[PDB]
Amino acid sequence: MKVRASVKPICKDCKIIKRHQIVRVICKTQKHKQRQG
Amino acid sequence: MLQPKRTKYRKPHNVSYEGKAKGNSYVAFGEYGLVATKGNWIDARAIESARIAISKCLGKTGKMWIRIFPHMSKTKKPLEVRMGSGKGNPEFWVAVVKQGTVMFEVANIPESQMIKALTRAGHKLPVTWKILKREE
Amino acid sequence: IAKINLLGGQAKPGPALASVGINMGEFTKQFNEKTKDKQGEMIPCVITAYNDKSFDFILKTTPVSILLKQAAKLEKGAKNAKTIVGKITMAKAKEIAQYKLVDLNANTVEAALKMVLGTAKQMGIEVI
Amino acid sequence: AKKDKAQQVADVSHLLSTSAGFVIFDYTSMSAIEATSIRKKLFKNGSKIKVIKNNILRRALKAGKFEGIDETAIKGKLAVAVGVNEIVETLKAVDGVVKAKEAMNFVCGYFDNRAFNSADLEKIAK
């Protein structure tokens, strides 16, 4: 995956959610996948 | 790095940088200003890096203006030295930013690119910032 | 189905027209022979879905933007659009607009002339 | 807004009372290409094609004193065709359209404002 200190959607259709107080971003392109923010 | 030409002394006091701003809160020439929520010290290299970064992404018609200028000297004695024995040498130049102080003002170019560029330039500054609109 | 803009002569430069079920040679010969009346003209040739899908071909009624280019007293168009070229009159614009009014599905003469002027104000020529 | 709503209601009511016989079908496989092709097919015939919302058209038909108020509420992509002046060309074009189309269902309207089925309309506009 990808680990950063902040997450931002570079692509358009990426959506932001929070599961178990962990913020994640989902896109149809696997390269737009950040997990820690 | 805008090094001063001549100085009366060499190793003065640094600053008492607490309290409100002595000025620079106003916006004069630009359309967007970058204000600070508190005060700290700004060294010379950071100013030059931020200025070249903001100018590289700037267009060909907008104009930017700096409100600060390094006017304080600093002493940093070389490593392994003991505490005492006179004062050291000058190593850099420090500008003082009090609370509620504006550092940059930019104008004459579309606003969205300007807010993006001001964010990307203020990320290079040690103090968290805030965008402020043109004062009439 | 196939969308392309080629010449009205040979069918060689068509790779999708010969990929849906229409053969190249036996039909490019037909295009060269039958359409010899308007040979050497840029017409968008299309095919439509049929039960056999071996021959169902049509072409839209002839639009000629090249006539506007030649009416500008030029042969190679200008990259820019704000430079006057030649001295065109209303006659050429009319002979193009009434020609292409059968291709502009909106049956309006003055609006067709205005549309030709608009597609010509970007070409780099102003109608009188 | 409601201002433009009322203005458009007045406009459609005026254009509806101006003509004698008006019909509106749907034809929901409408591909703008076929839409403008049929628009060309009209040409020289007085009627001007148009497209309006179903709510405002229902309100206009309610204010126009013609039977068949709720019949227009059915699903579809309504093509308003109120014949301008001369109306026989409009009916001829509509029957040519229904012959060309696989099938189009009777939405609303009649020629000489006495609503009936399209079977009589086929006889009149053949």
């Binding site: - | - | 040979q10 790779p15 040679g25 490019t28 | -």
Partner: protein, 134 residues
């Protein structure tokens, strides 16, 4: 390094010698000397042998071939077909075509071969001249 200087004009603007001295060979001996010095200053640009590559393709694997040609500093913006099969002509530099041979061979599964012909010599970019010396 001794690269071929071909079709170059020489114009002796000025010269002088010694009436009873200045042996003749020294002239030509000097001819290479000065030409070196200013030649170092001149910073010469190269001239690469540009060739033409004709590739017959069934127009089903042209993507890899076209991408490789683009990577090999060529000019491609379409296709030119012999009415049933596409024989594309591409301008290529000779400096990288040797590996490109087997790259094209493997990209098309060995289905498409080509022929080499000498087109001409064309001007070089700076990305070639920076490799002129170590």
């Amino acid at each position: 390094a001794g690269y071929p200087m071909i079709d170059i004009k020489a114009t002796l603007f000025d010269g002088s010698f010694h009436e009873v001295d200045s042996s003749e060979m020294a002239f030509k001996i000097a001819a290479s000397l000065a030409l070196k010095e200013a030649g170092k200053v001149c910073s010469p640009v190269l001239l690469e042998p540009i060739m033409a590559i004709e590739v017959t393709v069934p127009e089903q694997y042209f993507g890899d071939t076209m991408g490789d040609i683009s990577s090999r500093r060529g000019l491609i913006e379409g296709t030119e077909q012999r009415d049933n099969v596409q024989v594309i002509k591409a301008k290529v530099p000779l400096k990288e075509m040797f590996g490109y041979a087997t790259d094209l061979r493997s990209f098309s599964q060995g289905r498409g071969n080509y022929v080499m012909q000498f087109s001409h010599y064309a001007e070089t970019p700076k990305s070639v001249v920076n490799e002129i010396i170590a």
